[model samples]
Target: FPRVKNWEVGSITYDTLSAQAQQDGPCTPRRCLGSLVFPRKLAPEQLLSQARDFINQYYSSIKRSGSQAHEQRLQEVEAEVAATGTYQLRESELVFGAKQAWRNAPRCVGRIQWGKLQVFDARDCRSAQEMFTYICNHIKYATNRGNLRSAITVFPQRCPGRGDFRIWNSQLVRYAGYRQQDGSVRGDPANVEITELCIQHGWTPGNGRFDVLPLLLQAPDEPPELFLLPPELVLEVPLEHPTLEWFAALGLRWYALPAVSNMLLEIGGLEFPAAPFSGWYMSTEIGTRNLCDPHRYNILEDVAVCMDLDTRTTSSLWKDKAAVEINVAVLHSYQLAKVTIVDHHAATASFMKHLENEQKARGGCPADWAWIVPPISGSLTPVFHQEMVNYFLSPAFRYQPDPW
Candidate 1:
């Protein structure tokens, strides 16, 4: 099945039967940034307009009504940026902005815990080596020994002439994709580029189905750097069935974290080109999208065969049965392994709580229904039955162009 892509107009959405909608993303921000194709050209007039909107939202978030002082400062910022093509934010404001970016992330349904995210400051990093250290620190802090916590390490803003610090890998950890001679991919199809890029940079590619990809770190005025992640830092759960004795023999496993690296973090008119963040995974991302999506592992058929389902006919509902079982195994395995993972039922229900809280706190939570609903058993989830609206909010995590 195609990805459910809708961030829609003025609302800028997806799944409206358009071509980009098909490949276009309502790609959830919790794991990866969707294909947003943000235009590179920001005209002077556009920047001024954006500055006012960003400033207005910031004041509103801080719960201070606009005043002469606020207006004066806003004008100073506008004039400064309008003259210099740059602006700066304070550390306190940047911290608030990072948390709000997660809070306003449309594709992230797990935003109920948005206020709890830990923010990291790394704006002074001037070299690829420094960026790598910051990334390693992020991995260590976020991957807190199965008691995983959500965090974002903010790098420098995109400025004129000089390049911004950036991370090229989609996440801190991902399985390598190796194309086999039989015209089939051997591992995660999502990672073929990163894996090939690592190979190009002289990092020896592993033959295993679950080798972690190296980080493609880039700092201003320097060539990209490649750093392999130590195995201990990446905690993975060996996938095995809760009941089915044969399931463990499949040799499947996955990492415990879903940190997204490619998205641009937009806060009050300033944009951080490389702000990687992480949250705990909903089992469906691993079981439904990664393991079961047709373009991905497409393990439904293999699973059906193992479960002795009637795969000969669609009427038997073999695919559906196997899919449920796969998801069951995923949830059960994660829990048994003592790693943090949310099931679809629980995640959506928490999203309901989020909706109510945001209704009181911010009037509304901007949600893309297609992305909010789980891939399988959509009707069975609470978010499936809910009504949602679309809108924009500042301190947001917006999708940007792919690094490659």
Candidate 2:
């Protein structure tokens, strides 16, 4: 068993539950790769085995594990797989699995909201246009005029001899990055590949730094098609500081909803490649990582210059000062705009409570410490001091190679 210790509190916890996680990760007995953003991406166990296990877990969750219905459902799945080489999850099972996937998401700091997610079933969608409609609806429902909601729209599962239904953009909302004439990048550098893909797919590119990229949606065996999101459906908040009156002139802004579209949703043994999910932002995600990371907007120096902080030396702490103010501006803008957002302290504290709840309910929780801790002020948060055991659990959300 893994002994997890909180360095700050001097408390120890034995992760007995991690004993149940059987999937292998990037770690070897010789070295640990726990801090990597993505553990070097590496099974249909036998699909029936995983299916039965998930079915049993589902029945047990409803307090009917030993009932005749539970046994019958297991047999039903076995027969379906025997005849068709695959089985489909019932609506209730899909809902339960989606929630469990979020619960098992190791990198998510917002797993405390797992049970309340709105699972939208788009499994019947057969065309790219239909996929776009469902996605637009998801955005509308999740955005809710800036009062963000937690939701996912699950598309058809990957099937034998068929291509996967895929959302090409990493997120439902992203700014286009144009390769400039002088060989520099404009907009978000993180999205240059996706932005180029969009233009090649016949999308008319925009010139602004924050131009929202259109979606390139693909339905089985078909070339990906471009679909532009309605401007009204995509709610955005312009960045402004609560106290720094000059900050608004920088023209920084971000989408109201944080919906990841490229992650594969694995429920039981089935994989939904286009199940997009959204939750409200944790301020640091936007303020610290998205806006300040060197590969991202890289606005720390700019903001620091605006704040008149000395950028000549590392010891000046200008980056830290500017980053904090940017975070403050993000929090203030979202709050002033009435959009849902959580500051790092609140998000991490709630995650600590979630860990405690999971420890009692499931004996332990699977977490990636590198991700659970916010990008900024790592030591200032409780999760930074809390040792964690990271492992794979299904149903789960998994990273997939880009559709292109």
Candidate 3:
């Protein structure tokens, strides 16, 4: 029988590192000017036109009342776009404005759709502000009642975890061999066991789980001195593609919305103008390219998003440099002793005195570390009992039955 290990000697070491080493230069704004100036080679116009073509294809597919197959195709296309990083602008007025600007551009001439103009660029404006205003307005008009808003909202919440769960399943587990009791070797036996165990533990069965949750849980506890983990910094990147698919599957579409899309791109290391374009292309290509591949790119894409988000949103513990220094000093000084003595009370008193001295020297546990204090006498039992009750009785625990 395997027993739970007591006093698991897990030691976490902390040290300070210079922020200068970890801090990358501030994000550079995307070259919208380049897009405008070299419109042919860079093809900002072509990109916009391709996007419209995709939208038109999507709309045409949706309008025809056919098999669920058509609906599925529509969903696939929409999800591909959403995952690529357009989810944020799903609800933004900017998308409509862009569409309107494109439609009204001198080049658009004969191609403009008749009847209702979904987007309109105002008169006599040439600056980025004016261009953005038109783009935003067009986006709003095109997506006001469409799937964009819903898609954006849905993407972040999809099969969340840290890394690619499929990678762990398909690649990581193969190294462990499964042998039959009769001396026959079985393929991927270890993976099966690991998968079953993960399912039992309620972990989402894939690499994304590995990439997402552990990093998130550990991010705050991570020593400021340690290098920031890549998986943690890019949680959102993995999530973008899957989330978009999920939204489309649910029958929501709003190409012009920007809110959710923007958040996803921001978390995935894309900023503003560049983010809108790059994130869209990257996430979309990754999602679509991997759709039916044996490698499970969808899962990979989702895990990337999760990892990116975790990394981007991680708050620095060293924000108050002085506070961290004090914490480190106190942690260094505080020592706990396990003594088996004839006089238990005396040993306890000695321990308390040592703790008090350390507390005084170290500026008395920073507010966050106050919980480190050992309980005085019988307090441990009550605390343990409360934890048991909370675990067994809480709503989160109610659905899962105990093995006993």
Candidate 4:
């Protein structure tokens, strides 16, 4: 996380009137509201189908008939692809598509502004319902619409408990303005309106909560099997520091070497005969060196080479190089072996325990934390787990499926 400095009182005007009001009265009342107009009793299967159809239609309309003059035209095409079945292949398209769709469609835009207090306009009833239905059905369908009606319901923990509202459908789809007590605008009112509108309609204000709804709608009825990928095991060689800042700085650089080393170990596991210590060392070093440019040095290369040698030597004390290499390759053959035996066992065990709780739920409104349900299913469990694992382990796995 990046650090930001707090603004000093002297840096800006401190109106005595504003200060007096702050000292004399409650600036704003706290309210906890939820948006739950949609019923959760509707069958998941049926709702899923309907949501998918809605998104599909929405995508089609944008692609075939909308003005093609904006910079976001390509995004419109991508969203269509995401809403369709081809989401995994062209994931970024969905983001672009959603952005373009919201910009062009009058029904989809809504605005939310955040500060000490947040305001939301539920667009027109139909657009409001579409947005709510889309969020509920795909992102959190199991949770009732009423559960989301008040405050910013997506992830309540991220904000200061008391001040946020979501507004749907109004001419001010692109309106967002914040004012001081005197009614003077804090910034460019138009920019603020546009931002608030974008935040409310898109995934920004809601966290990453809204994006996955479309994907959930389009997912197959029969859940996909859990395909276990290798676990990402990160090892750290801690640095000694007299001060916290010094420790942090050293830790950042020190951790990268081991992290890269572990990645190479995992990658080597996938290949036959595995690369030799020298080969792995040379390859990894060259790669890192290319990235470092002018700062590249033999010292860094030697550190990596030495570490690789130590790993190989320790694993192969009793055997020849060829024998050791073969054994390591075989050991790496089972990707799930690491996760099942080591990493995810506890999470799986906890999830199994949670299943009992889910069975007893009696199908009432899902709790705020109900999003944890889908990933627990036998079919979705492995697919999601492997996808998460691959995301962390492989740098090339950047393709993000449309979250709808």
Clashes of 2: 0
What are the clash counts of all predictions, listed in order? Answer: 9, 0, 70, 29
The window of 10 residues in a row where model 1 has the poorest summed lDDT is 14-23
Best by lDDT: 2
For model 1, residues 188-266, the per-residue Cα lDDT tens digits are 9988888898899888988988888888898887777988787778889988888898988998888898999988998
Q: How accurate locally is residue 332 in candidate 2, as Cα lDDT from 0 to 100?
A: 95
lDDT of 2 by residue, 50-134 (tens): 8988998899999999899999998899889988889999999999999999999888999899899999999899899999999
Give candidate 1's TM-score. Answer: 0.86
**Model 3 has how many clashing residue pairs?**
70
Go through the candidates in order and give each one's C-alpha lDDT. 0.79, 0.92, 0.25, 0.23
lDDT of 3 by residue, 1-404 (tens): 11211122332212111111211222235532321312232123433334444344334434644457555544554565456533222332333333322222221111112113332313233233333343344434334332222111111211223211011122110112233479643332323444444444454434322221111111111211111122322212112122223422222111112221121111111112111210011112122222212333123223334233333333632222322222222222121111111122333333334323423432211111112112222233221111100000000000111111
lDDT of 4 by residue, 131-235 (tens): 334333221211122121111111110012222122221111111234347865433243334334344444243222011111111111122111111112111
Q: lDDT of model 3 at residue 126?
A: 29
Ranking by TM-score: 2, 1, 4, 3
Question: 311, model 2: CA deviation in Å?
Answer: 1.3
Candidate number that wins on lDDT, 1 or 4:
1
User: Evaluated with TM-score, which candidate comes out highest?
Assistant: 2
Please list all clashing residue pairs in model 2, or write none if there are none.
none
Over 4 Å off, model 1: 1-45, 67-83
Which runs in model 4 stand beyond 4 Å of their true positions?
A: 1-309, 312-346, 359-404
